[PDB]
Design a protein around this ligand. Structure first.
Ligand SMILES: NC[C@@H](N)Cn1cc(F)c(=O)[nH]c1=O
Ligand SMILES: NC[C@H](N)Cn1cc(F)c(=O)[nH]c1=O
Ligand SMILES: NC[C@H](N)Cn1cc(F)c(=O)[nH]c1=O
Lengths: 242, 246, 251, 251, 245, 245
């Protein structure tokens, strides 16, 4: 009746079938306060589970922590409780020069540089969002006033070598990832983040709806964004309740 | 002079930046005839080529033949002649019982059960269409009055074992594909075809816009209406093309 | 028994057990005209099927279109209708400086740079031709007055990046195939083409006998530019060779 | 200019070159408060950081959050601030019958069911603890009076399908992991966890010392839920072992 | 410098450009005995080397030992010493019921169930004999009187699980190889052995000629040991003769 | 009532032996068993020389494995069928770290699986690691001999040449996979190259058998002493003794 990690029950969600899933537990309260009567439900480790109401419908806000592994946990347990739509909000780093800090990235597809996506569908299966969620997100983003890019997102199990950072303890990137950033760029990939591949694959392959939206905070080639980011997702969420 | 396979020049396209790419050459004339001023350009192997006009703009219509390799050739040479947008069109068989014959499947992503996609991007790259193209296609498809499904398509390099068919010469399916049909169905995969993985990956990784839409003519949850769904299918890809052009 | 794609029946074949399978439909007519009383059986998509008699014996000639996916459908449906032997003929580009435009290459194994071969057997399985088809083919090739090479062919699902061509729209090649031409060269690979890996693997793993012979129409290593005389000559040669190979295979 | 995620500087570590890295942030204070002069340093996200002293040497305790990605970040950033030794403590579920609740598992190697390890070394590289750290944990564990097992831990990027759980929303396990648990049992594997393949591989291939010890609180081969005073006892003991093990690693 | 494992010099070979490479060091002397002027050269580990002559020309017989790594070493070092052509000979157990005891199999290609081949060429590359060697081997086998099969050989890094043997210490076979024998059986694979994938791939990818011929002494699905052995080595020496003239 | 296929021995012949020392060279077997009591020739077929000896009153096996995981996995499988449960690899090796000197001892705590045969026992993800007691016992025997001792990762290769990135060979070619590879393993702290540990360790750890590897440094590519060869088998014999108590 009560899930293993989130420590909540189905009655707790008051029939919520949509969750906004940031990674940061501190984003959780703040997102809920762009909605109504935010109720604390549980807080175990990186998962802080809040209920709130949005346009007179119950919705979940659940932090996921960092990485596909912690994410796959939150999504599975919430789905056990009836949740069917999962909205990913956060911030990202752009790798295309034409993309500016302030812009929103809505993922049309994730490059699968993770491990947990593989635990749901084999590698040939695409990491793709639900079209309705991506649509709602694009719309909500455009209406916000921001410049908006639809495109492919590289989703990496690491922050440093998998995103080809050299400014690290050993200054070394494993062979697979050497020259990788330039490869994604010439392939038109827009950004690097760390959760969308597991999110989109586990959802696309398990009859769940998911999408990813994110604000550009750094550009490896070249606040208002963070605030307009959760603003954009709460509105994307609104659009999704039809 | 001309591109190596298609046998057309950039002059023949008359400034076309959008191509419609049906699989079978026999349908090329039908599609071009839904537009303004059809003209036959050439026929070489499985590449039958026509030029037409849509709202005052040139449009190429070009068959691809079957499978990722001949598709990869058409799309490459087309791109050399200035095409930047590709709308794939055809008829398909669904594998999800809730999908009726007559409906339109607009592919949001493809399972890469091909070889040619790996020649453009490693297996981790998503085989996804351009958002604008999938958006026009869904718009066009709904406009035609049919029910529309956006979802995943399994793109195989073979018609038989890769689509786990046992009624064959050997009766045999290689380990990789035994149980695969039920695996895809459980994963929500909508249908099978054989060029979308190669198309979507080559274009997504090369600065090109691509999309697929198909009419369901049969359900593997086992037709008569083949002619009609086809007609509806190419009307939709011509309307999607118009939306993409303006 | 009308097969799904080729749309012919076993009757249509008259007991034919051997097929010659070019890629181009246009070449099916000419291979036929090297044999007797050509019978158009069907034509759907890139698949053009013809019965013809060679040495008083019924033999199919079937176009396969470009690529393993297209080829596997054609071989599968032929095989459902009694064909046990298949001879691939075509053109190829050589990557060894000692191989001249106009020579004949008979494939002894293919590098599997394709996807359809995997739908019949795992990568560890060798894409190898039937020993008798390769023997007959080499013999036919010598007898026709051409220089003949036996060896490994790299068989690619693409004509462009998988054969490391940079003269393309993007002008770039994915990591896997970056530097790959020089690697095949250093390994003794003779040439590139697009269908041998799927054919050989599927046939070798399915109790079908098969082989591939191609005429060299370009050498990426030779600065020389060939002509149209020897071009037309060695394509006429190749299909003339593939018919003498088939004859040797019949008895 | 603190590290991006962790929110600490090298001066806050006070010259510490050893870290205890539990998964749960709620445990960091408890671990620190077994040492001398524990101070709260920072808490961002799932990263809760404390400092303490052990026998006259500064020690850091930093939580990692669930999974390889979250762990790799903590480890990388801890190393940038000078940490060269990483000791993982936690509780776990053993998949072998002969392994009992309250026992200690000390990992000598990890099956790599993660993705983050691959970002440091290719799959061929073993996910191996530092011999001195694993030696130090075996000694600490034994002296605690508990039964100790040295063996293989299966380390999965998921808690459900990748540990072959069927009690889930879809009830589905992907082919790769169907039958996998019996495979691991047959191969002598002691337990599932979710962070050891990444940590071990990252450290082994990066000039850092790491090892893993966990307390067995439940056995999946056994129906029962164990005594819930054994829960806290095993838990209390688990951190008493890694603190003693850490003291051994110093000196 | 001089060859590290083999313990012979290029001079010791007296210009030999062809080697006959058996697995068992015990068969080296007897292969060499069928040829003119047999001479013991060296014995280090699994590597027993002899020289002999075939119609005026020097030949080496060098045992390889068991498995691809041992074989990769011998071939490489013989290659350093001037060898260009390698004829593998031996005995085998068929897995096709239609292949009878005393028949000869000539490998036209190997399934790469090995690791060492990957040290010479990616998996996509075919483990395939030289056409000339396989043709000479066919002809020598045919001329012997034995029924001759040209086909695919499965080449395994293990004798036990990778050939799907369950009569073992664990009784257990890893997933990749569960049901694998039937699969090879269905695909037409003629037999199992343990060195050909490594030999064929490293030769085919390094400008060396090579082939494999083997006598069928037993069938998995179902005197002769002495007899098939003799026929097998007479076959390879005749093959070696054809290759030199 | 049963003789193993390759080794040609029975469980009776082992006299209750549950421990084997397993070097490469059969010539080392007689060397190793000379450090022990009442050596007994059990068999020799191909590259497998099998000796029973008594060590500190207990029955113990010494068995050569030849070169490579394939040959080695057969030896281990068949000894395991005969009750052997603990395996001690001894050998020579070549370091790739400058601080490691000729004459040092390396105890393998993990192997990079650059082999094929490991895969026949467990998927690639499974760690090729030694039993802890054996590694510990070996470290102990190594330090007690006076020599300098390193614990760490070993790169374990199905080839002597291209998979250890040697270019001093017939072709001078190294396949892409192993191009740049020595520098990669050097950067990852890898200690040494050899050719059997991955197969041995993976097969044993996945089959409920205990094993470990100790080797004497005879070369450093970034920079044989008979003393260090003798050191090596004395340590392994002494490691065995600590394993028997
Ligand atoms: N006989 C050589 C081999 N079995 C052990 N070895 C010794 C070396 F020095 C080396 O660099 N690589 C090896 O594999
Ligand atoms: N703390 C980082 C989050 N995991 C997402 N993210 C954000 C970036 F800016 C970035 O460059 N990379 C990235 O992964
Ligand atoms: N039209 C191309 C055919 N697929 C065969 N071919 C021909 C070449 F010249 C060539 O360089 N590559 C190649 O594959």
């Amino acid at each position: 009746k009560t899930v293993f990690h989130l420590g909540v029950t189905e009655a707790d969600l008051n029939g919520a079938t949509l969750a906004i899933i940031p990674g940061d537990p501190a984003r959780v309260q703040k997102i809920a306060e762009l909605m109504d009567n935010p109720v604390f439900l549980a807080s175990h480790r990186e998962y802080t589970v809040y209920r709130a109401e949005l346009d007179g419908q119950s919705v979940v806000v659940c932090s996921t922590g960092i990485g596909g592994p912690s994410t796959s946990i939150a999504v599975e347990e919430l789905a056990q409780l009836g949740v069917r739509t999962f909205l990913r909000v956060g911030t990202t780093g752009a790798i295309q020069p034409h993309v500016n800090v302030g812009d929103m990235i809505v993922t049309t597809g994730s490059v699968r540089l993770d491990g947990a996506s593989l635990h749901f569908a084999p590698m040939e299966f695409p990491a793709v969002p639900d079209f309705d969620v991506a649509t709602a997100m694009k719309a909500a983003a455009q209406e916000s006033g921001a410049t908006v890019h639809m495109g492919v997102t590289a989703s990496s199990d690491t922050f440093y070598p998998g995103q080809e950072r050299y400014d690290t303890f050993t200054g070394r990137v494993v062979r697979r990832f050497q020259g990788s950033m330039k490869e994604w760029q010439d392939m038109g990939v827009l950004n690097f983040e760390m959760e969308s591949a597991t999110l989109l694959t586990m959802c696309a392959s398990s009859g769940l709806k998911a999408g990813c939206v994110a604000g550009v905070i750094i550009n490896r080639t070249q606040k208002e964004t963070e605030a307009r980011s959760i603003k954009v997702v709460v509105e994307a969420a609104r659009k999704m309740l039809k």
